[PDB]
């Protein structure tokens, strides 16, 4: 009680100091951030020396007295000082031994499941370690120098400006800004954090700190040998180095991983949708992407948050995010294969050959990725220059060099011709001529003598001694009898190039991209795998996938209607539960839209039941507002509920119906909805703070009494309120309709100017 | 990176429009972000409603190109003739049928509103935002909706720019857009205009020859001629393979520059108490009731510089020592840490004494005199290198619990290595040098300005592996000498060390220590008492090197790298656990006898390494670290001619110079150098590539 | 490439343009004027800064920019006030 | 952040905490008003400066 | 090959040419910025050393 008057004294006592006084008046609050950095803990010129100082003195450390006071014994139990009255700070001087004392002896309890989840992180990677099997040899190892590889990874990884805000919203509501982006879209992880963190205020400063961490791969630039799941990096240094090597390893890693590659092919498909139809790309593989919902582990996520932040770039997901405004670059992707650029510059050319084609005349130096195989180009005058390849299997080495042929594009180029005209030239699609590099490509990747084809192409010289362990033979061995001109294999791996950079433009009608004014960096169509597996994954909206039936349709969409158009103000579902009248909800026209779809046999039978629970709900404190949905369509008319032949239970979640637990979300058959601003469901009381707002900012005009956040949920539609927002800043708002059209809106117009 | 920065808070397409506007209807590479608002700011306003009829509401003018808008500006007079608005306005509106003009502005809104109100007047639906919530508008406000809308819009972007603290840049034309330039000082401009380097003065000329420059192939000239006038030397290093052998200074021989004796150092054993020995500074005082309490050196000593001081003193510690460990002198201390203040004159009066010159006023610096090569630091390391009686003097730690694949590897090296090493005589001193520094380091904290009796100990257990069951390993601690601090100067301690030692003194090596003849010790063996020698000696102590000296253990580890690494360089080759084997098998070449050529296998030629890096941690002169870091391009050289690479150095006399430069009066740093000499010779002699004088 | 600087000064202007003045803190020590010393940044910029408010009035500026401005604006002050400790006995 | 005074929004955010403990927590209401008086009479010395 | 070292280093170079160099780089940039690059060699080329 006086812990709130002693700081209004303070302040009292700081604004008659007419010094501080014009300091804490002039200007923004962001000053603080200067403030606090004009102080200086101490002077740092000798660390290990000054502690070894610090500590050689019996009673320098500074320390908390009240606690120590009220909990135990200041005194000793051997007769040698502990505590004196003697001070500037309100901490009291105290000796280290203390510390020790209150560890063994003090009276404490219970604490156990509190700690570890707030370091999950820590407690994880120890986890992992328990989980693995051993053994041990030696080798001269050859690493792989350089790659910039997730460490330390965790499942819902994220940017650091986002983080921030969840650190915002789960350490304290009281000082938090209205971030809607965050937290409409990623709701529920916000719940599960909020929820085990905010009820028991302990260490406020430290598990933020520590949370800030628990979502950041540390993407280090480190020397790995072959292994490279972003597990095994954590632990590196044990398993193995230049001369060190361990096993067993591979199988116990987090479920992050794989759900990865799941994303990419997920991309893969939304990528061939818009492949599907050539009238636009643009305008369309968008909606795909906004559309499709994602079901992370213990999380539903938007699609569109993990393409824009995912970190591992393929071919796919740069296409993916090419649609958006993310900007990933330093990446170049060719087919299945990898690349970087190093060296050099030039510009595309046109050049008709007898097999329109597009050479580049660089003198350029480039770095090869592919599987189990790297290696390094240079290409001048649309010829290879030099060559090296630092491969682990034969084959891949074959593959590498191929496909690096493929896109040097020698004269050898256009002299063979079996078939391509038949098929490879003019692709399926709307009519559409398909780019040539590509054209021979596919033509590789046909068959097996196709790949002997242009590796015979190539000059063939028996190499020279100083050339046995350098030569590459045709099947991709080091014997050196016969062997590729201007190559030459290394006994060893090849390092990765790295550049801090990021680029974006637009994509062509064709899922090109033409970024930084040319590169080609799209390819196109990387792989055509023409397969539709899925596991928990949502779809919406046209998708030209069938997984919508008529009955099923009529179902989803006709619960749809009620939920989604629910809400806004008075004559919608929260106006009419805030004034406990439960008859207008049942006559409402949403629900005459779903009436016709249920049994007609036991119609009454059914509206009975569904008519009772309503009104039993309608007492504040036990209605659960999930369940209202359910049961409401059924009460119109005058257990098991068949709407056209498919039952839906109260409770029990079902196929039609899934009623999820501890999170605002609902699945039908294939797909989700869910709304946010009307919940005050009994579950939902740790963001009951955060869920009711489907409030906007208005004018700052009336005498609105500020209230309190926790206050906020009384006050009805149509009630402009003032309210304390953020670090400082005092807005206005009221109950308003959703947010809408944030993209559309303006994409729309800038579709109708051209 | 300004799209990065607009493209991250507003939306992906809306930027382009900036992007594409901000070529041609200005030129502000910043400014895409305050429009990039503007723009977004109107479609929200226009899109989502549409008149009663299919056609509708608003229609959007501004994102169109500003030649475009001009002509659309124009269809109004065709539309409605009214007078042709000079002002192109931002929105046309058809249900109201007026011109509409958004304005968003930071401040107090009167400020924008009432310059925009003098542009147009009454004329357009001219409506003006500000981010924090606050409003001026003509008459009419748009509907209850899209000001819900578009304000809460505004209110976070606001936020967004308060996080990355974009707000003085973004001000609209009439306010600071105009205000943009950097602000020219006439001091400024002044400096600038006669800083250039060129014949031109002012700077404009100097920024036009560099904004129209354009480069020619004259360069290849310039660098002829450069190189015509340069003479560089194109060396080769066939012709000068001898380098001179090495330079050496020539003198009096190098004296003993480490704090503390080794070789001759005496001991004087004592089994330890754990409740006793605690104290560490107690250790002397339980010392005192046995034999110490007798030893007392004679008047006249061999070889002193100051004996009757020393002399004194020593009966002050040892009249210390039965009392309490500290010296109780006020006016002794001064004279013996003088052993001298100098008393000074303000300028301003000396002026007088310049004019009158009196007590002889001159100005004078002092440089330190060059010693000559050692012979007895040869005999030192092969003392150092021996095992000792004693078995273990750095405490070490305990062994972690182990996981058999790399643990068992680690925990074995580590026990093997630490067996080697703690049995030797250099560990002892390590042992001595980190407990007394230690102690001393803890004293000075404890009594600053006073005088204090510290003792020169090191800690040692005794091992017995005879087979039989005796009563223990023997636990303990032995005793070097005394010591006494001095606190003087923060900055350098003055201090006092006092060694009993069994062997004659040298004066060639000794000759700052200053020696006397104590009396006798009992010496004794079975399967007899020499006399006892008291050196003495004063030196200086940096807190620094008190610091680095107390942590000397340090050299156990850059021993064991360079160790290690090669027993696993060999093993890899084979792909077997050849650590074992390469430890006892591989040779490794330790010295010369006879003239021939020695090796030793490298777990004993490892205690020269450690032996190596503990004097680098003792000998460390500032002529020591500019030695290796010059030394360093001859070994360079030396591998180069190794493995016949055909190198070469520019201007070697002139290495050789920076070499010798760095040559003064260390022992060690002059050692090394003599030793380098007889590897080159030695090398020279395998293979050819160097001179033997 | 063809425009290396323009770009890479873009990337600067707009770190820079950015930046709070307050960032300046962070760094090795540098020379105080006000008592003619070496100091840890932060303190002597506070000494700096202060100054400047008790000669002119408080700095408003919170960028790199205006703190620029400011210290090109002090060359032409013909007078400037300190923070300077003098001992009487 | 925000574009408000530290003083004004610290003396903003104590009068909501103690709304929010008076309201429904366990503190007195004349205690409140001293609250209040206190922070009104902190303004005042802030704003002859 | 050849090991590289320097003698003299900071020495030898000048924020004489420092300016030109920066003139020469800020082109094309902005004159607004380009005032604010070559500000910093200036108070070099007119530099107190204590």
Redesign the interface.
Same mark, same amino acid.
């Not at chain 3, 890479?8 to 990337?11: F, I, L, Q, S």
């Not at chain 3, 343009?17 to 307050?22: A, E, G, N, R, V």
């Given at each position: 009680m006086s812990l709130l008057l002693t700081i209004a004294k303070e302040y009292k006592r700081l604004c008659q100091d007419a010094k501080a006084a014009?300091?804490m008046t002039?200007?923004?609050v962001?000053?603080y951030?200067?403030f606090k950095?004009?102080?200086?803990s101490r002077k740092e010129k000798n660390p290990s020396l000054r502690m070894r100082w610090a500590m050689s003195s019996k009673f320098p450390i500074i320390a908390n007295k009240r606690m120590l006071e009220e909990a135990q014994i200041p005194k000793e139990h051997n007769n040698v000082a502990l505590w004196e009255d003697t001070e500037k700070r309100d901490h009291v001087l105290a000796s280290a031994s203390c510390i020790n004392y209150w560890n063994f002896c003090g009276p404490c309890v219970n604490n156990s499941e509190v700690i570890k989840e707030v370091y999950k992180s820590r407690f994880g990677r120890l986890e992992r370690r328990k989980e693995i099997m051993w053994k041990e040899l030696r080798f001269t190892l050859v690493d792989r120098q350089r790659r910039r590889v997730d460490t330390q990874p965790v499942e819902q990884r994220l940017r650091t400006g986002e983080i921030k805000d969840l650190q915002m919203w789960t350490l304290f509501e009281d000082e938090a800004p209205l971030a809607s982006k965050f937290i409409l879209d990623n709701y529920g992880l916000v719940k599960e954090m909020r929820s085990k963190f905010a009820n028991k205020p302990l260490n406020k400063e430290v598990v933020a700190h520590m949370l800030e961490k628990q979502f950041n791969p540390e993407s280090r630039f480190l020397p790995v040998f072959g292994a490279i799941r972003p597990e095994r990096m954590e632990l590196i240094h044990a398993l193995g180095g230049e001369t060190w090597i361990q096993e067993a390893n591979t199988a116990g890693i987090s479920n992050v991983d794989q759900r990865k590659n799941d994303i990419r092919a997920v991309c893969r498909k939304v990528c061939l949708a818009a492949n599907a139809s050539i009238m636009n790309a643009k305008s369309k593989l968008v909606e795909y992407i906004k559309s499709t919902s994602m079901r992370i582990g213990e999380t539903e996520r938007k699609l569109e948050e993990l393409i824009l932040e995912t970190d591992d770039v393929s071919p796919e997901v740069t296409l993916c995010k090419s649609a958006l405004g993310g900007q990933l670059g330093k990446t170049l992707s060719f087919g299945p294969m990898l690349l970087k650029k190093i060296s050099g510059?030039g510009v595309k050319v046109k050049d008709t050959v007898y097999i329109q084609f597009e050479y580049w005349s660089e003198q350029e130096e480039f770095y090869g990725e592919y599987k189990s195989a790297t290696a390094l180009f240079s290409r001048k005058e649309r010829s290879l220059e030099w060559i090296t390849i630092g491969g682990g299997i034969n084959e891949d080495r074959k593959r590498l060099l191929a496909m690096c042929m493929i896109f040097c594009r020698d004269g050898d180029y256009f002299k063979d011709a079996p078939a391509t005209i038949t098929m490879a030239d003019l692709s399926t699609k709307l009519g559409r001529e398909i780019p040539y590099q590509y054209v021979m490509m596919n033509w590789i990747q046909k068959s097996e003598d196709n790949l002997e084809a242009l590796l015979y192409s190539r000059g063939i010289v028996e190499t020279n001694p100083g050339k046995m362990g350098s030569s590459m033979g045709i099947d991709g061995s080091k014997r050196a009898i016969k062997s590729l001109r201007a190559v030459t294999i290394q006994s060893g791996k090849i390092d990765m190039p790295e550049s801090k950079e990021k680029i974006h433009l637009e994509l062509s009608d064709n899922l090109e991209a033409f970024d930084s004014s040319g590169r080609i960096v799209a390819t196109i169509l990387d792989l055509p795998s023409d397969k539709k597996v899925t596991f928990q994954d949502v779809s919406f909206q046209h998708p030209d996938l069938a997984v919508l039936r008529d009955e099923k349709t009529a179902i989803t969409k006709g619960y749809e209607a009620l939920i989604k158009r629910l809400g806004t103000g008075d004559n919608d579902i929260p106006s009419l539960i805030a004034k406990k009248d439960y008859l207008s909800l049942y006559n409402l026209p949403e629900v005459k839209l779903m009436a016709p779809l249920i049994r007609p046999n036991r119609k009454g039978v059914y509206s009975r039941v569904a008519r009772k629970l309503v009104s039993t709900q309608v007492t504040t404190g036990h209605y659960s507002l999930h369940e209202l949905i359910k049961v409401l369509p059924f009460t119109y008319f005058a257990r098991l509920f068949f709407s056209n032949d498919s039952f839906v239970e109260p409770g029990v979640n079902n196929n039609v119906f899934s009623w999820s637990k501890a999170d605002s979300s609902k699945i039908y058959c294939h797909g989700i909805a869910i709304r946010v601003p009307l919940v005050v469901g009994d579950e939902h009381m740790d963001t009951s703070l955060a869920l009711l707002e489907g409030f906007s900012v208005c004018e700052n005009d009336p005498r609105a009494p500020m209230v309190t956040r926790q206050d906020l949920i009384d006050v009805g539609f149509g009630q402009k309120v003032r309210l304390f927002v953020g670090q400082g800043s005092v807005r206005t708002f009221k109950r308003t309709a959703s947010q809408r059209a944030a993209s559309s809106d303006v994409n729309k117009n800038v579709k109708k100017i051209k | 990176?300004?799209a990065?920065?607009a493209e991250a808070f507003l939306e992906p397409e809306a930027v382009r429009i900036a992007k594409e506007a901000v070529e041609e209807y200005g030129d502000h590479?910043?400014k895409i972000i305050q429009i990039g608002i503007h723009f977004q700011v109107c479609c929200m306003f226009c899109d989502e409603y549409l008149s009663t009829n299919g056609s509708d509401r608003f229609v959007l003018i501004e994102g169109r190109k500003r030649g475009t808008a001009v002509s659309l500006q124009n269809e109004l007079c065709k539309s409605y003739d009214l007078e042709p608005l000079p002002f192109l306005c931002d929105i046309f509106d058809r249900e109201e049928k007026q011109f509409v003009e958004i304005g968003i502005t930071r401040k107090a809104d009167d400020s924008y509103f009432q310059s925009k109100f003098g542009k147009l007047g009454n004329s357009c639906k001219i409506f003006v935002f500000s981010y924090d919530g606050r409003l001026d508008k003509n008459c009419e406000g748009p509907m209850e909706e899209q000001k819900l809308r578009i304000f809460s819009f505004l209110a976070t972007a606001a936020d967004f720019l308060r996080k990355?603290?974009?707000?003085?840049?973004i001000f609209l034309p009439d306010n600071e857009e105009t205000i943009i330039e950097?602000?020219k000082?006439?001091?400024?401009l002044e400096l600038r205009d006669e800083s250039v380097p060129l014949p031109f003065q002012t700077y404009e000329q100097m920024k036009d020859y560099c904004e129209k420059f354009k480069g020619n192939p004259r360069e290849l000239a310039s660098k002829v001629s450069q190189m015509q006038s340069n003479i560089k030397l194109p060396i080769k290093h066939y012709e000068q393979n001898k380098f001179r052998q090495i330079r050496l200074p020539k003198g009096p021989m190098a004296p003993y520059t480490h704090k503390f004796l080794m070789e001759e150092a005496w001991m004087f054993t004592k089994i330890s108490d754990p409740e006793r020995s605690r104290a560490g500074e107690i250790l002397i005082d339980f010392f005192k009731k046995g034999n110490l309490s007798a030893i007392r050196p004679k008047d006249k000593p061999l070889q002193g510089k100051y004996p009757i001081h020393y002399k004194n003193l020593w009966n002050q510690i040892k009249a210390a020592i039965a009392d309490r460990t500290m010296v109780i002198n006020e006016n002794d201390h001064s004279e013996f840490l003088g052993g001298r203040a100098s008393k000074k004159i303000p300028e301003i009066s000396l002026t007088q004494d310049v004019i009158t010159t009196e007590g002889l006023k001159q100005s004078e610096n002092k440089l330190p005199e060059p010693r000559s090569f050692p012979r007895w630091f040869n005999a030192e390391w092969m003392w150092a290198i021996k095992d000792s009686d004693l078995t273990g003097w750095v405490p070490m730690a305990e062994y972690p619990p182990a996981d058999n694949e790399l643990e068992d590897y680690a925990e074995h090296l580590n026990k093997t290595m630490e067996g080697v090493l703690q049995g030797t005589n250099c560990a002892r001193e390590m042992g001595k040098c980190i407990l007394t520094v230690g102690a001393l380091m803890t004293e000075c904290r404890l009594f600053p300005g006073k005088i204090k009796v510290v003792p020169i100990y090191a800690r040692s257990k005794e091992r017995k592996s005879m087979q039989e069951g005796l009563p223990v390993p023997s636990e303990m601690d032995c005793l070097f000498g005394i010591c006494v601090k001095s606190k003087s100067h923060d900055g350098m301690y003055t201090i006092i060390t006092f060694e009993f030692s069994i062997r004659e003194p040298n004066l060639e090596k000794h000759q700052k220590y200053t020696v006397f003849e104590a009396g006798h010790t009992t010496v004794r063996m079975k399967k007899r008492e020499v006399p006892l020698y008291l050196y003495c000696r004063t030196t200086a102590l940096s807190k620094i090197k008190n610091d680095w000296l107390s942590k000397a253990r340090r050299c156990f580890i850059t021993t064991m790298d360079t160790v290690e690494t090669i027993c696993l360089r060999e093993s890899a080759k084979a792909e077997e656990n050849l650590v074992e084997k390469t430890l006892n098998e591989k040779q490794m070449w330790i010295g010369k006898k006879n003239g021939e050529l020695i090796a030793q296998p490298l777990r004993e030629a490892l205690r020269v390494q450690l032996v190596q890096q503990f004097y680098f941690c003792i000998y460390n002169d500032s002529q020591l670290e500019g030695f290796c870091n010059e030394q360093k391009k001859i070994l360079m050289a030396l591998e180069g001619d190794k493995k016949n690479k055909s190198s070469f150095g520019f201007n070697p006399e002139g290495l050789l110079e920076k070499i010798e430069e760095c040559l003064i009066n260390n022992p060690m740093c002059l050692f090394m150098a003599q030793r380098l000499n007889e590897l080159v010779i030695e090398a020279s002699k395998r293979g050819a590539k160097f001179f033997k004088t | 490439?063809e425009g290396f600087?323009?770009h890479?000064?873009?990337?600067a202007? @707009?770190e820079i343009?950015?930046?709070?003045?307050?960032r300046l803190?962070?760094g090795r020590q540098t020379y105080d004027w006000t008592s003619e010393r070496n100091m840890?940044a932060? @303190?002597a910029?506070?000494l700096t800064v202060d100054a400047i408010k008790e000669t002119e009035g408080?700095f408003?500026g @919170? @960028?790199m920019?205006?703190y620029?401005?400011k210290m090109?604006?002090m060359?032409?002050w013909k007078e400037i006030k300190f923070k300077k400790v003098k001992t009487v006995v | 952040i925000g574009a408000m005074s530290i003083g004004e929004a610290i003396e903003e955010k104590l009068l909501e905490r103690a709304k929010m403990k008076r309201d429904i927590g366990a503190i007195e209401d004349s205690e409140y008003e001293e609250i209040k008086d206190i922070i009104r009479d902190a303004k005042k010395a802030r704003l002859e400066s | 090959n050849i090991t590289g070292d320097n003698s003299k280093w900071n020495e030898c170079q000048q924020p004489e040419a420092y300016l030109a160099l920066l003139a020469?780089?800020?082109?094309?940039?902005?004159d607004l910025?380009k005032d604010?690059?070559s500000?910093a060699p200036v108070l070099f080329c007119n530099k107190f050393v204590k």
């Open positions: 014009q300091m002039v200007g923004t962001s000053n951030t200067t950095k004009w102080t200086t510059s | 990176t300004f990065e920065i590479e910043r990355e603290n974009m707000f003085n840049e950097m602000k000082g006439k001091t400024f | 490439g600087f323009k890479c000064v873009m990337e202007e @707009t343009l950015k930046m709070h003045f307050s803190t962070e840890p932060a @303190t910029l506070q408080p408003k @919170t @960028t920019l205006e620029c401005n090109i604006e060359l032409d | - | 020469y780089i800020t082109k094309d940039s902005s910025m604010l690059c500000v």
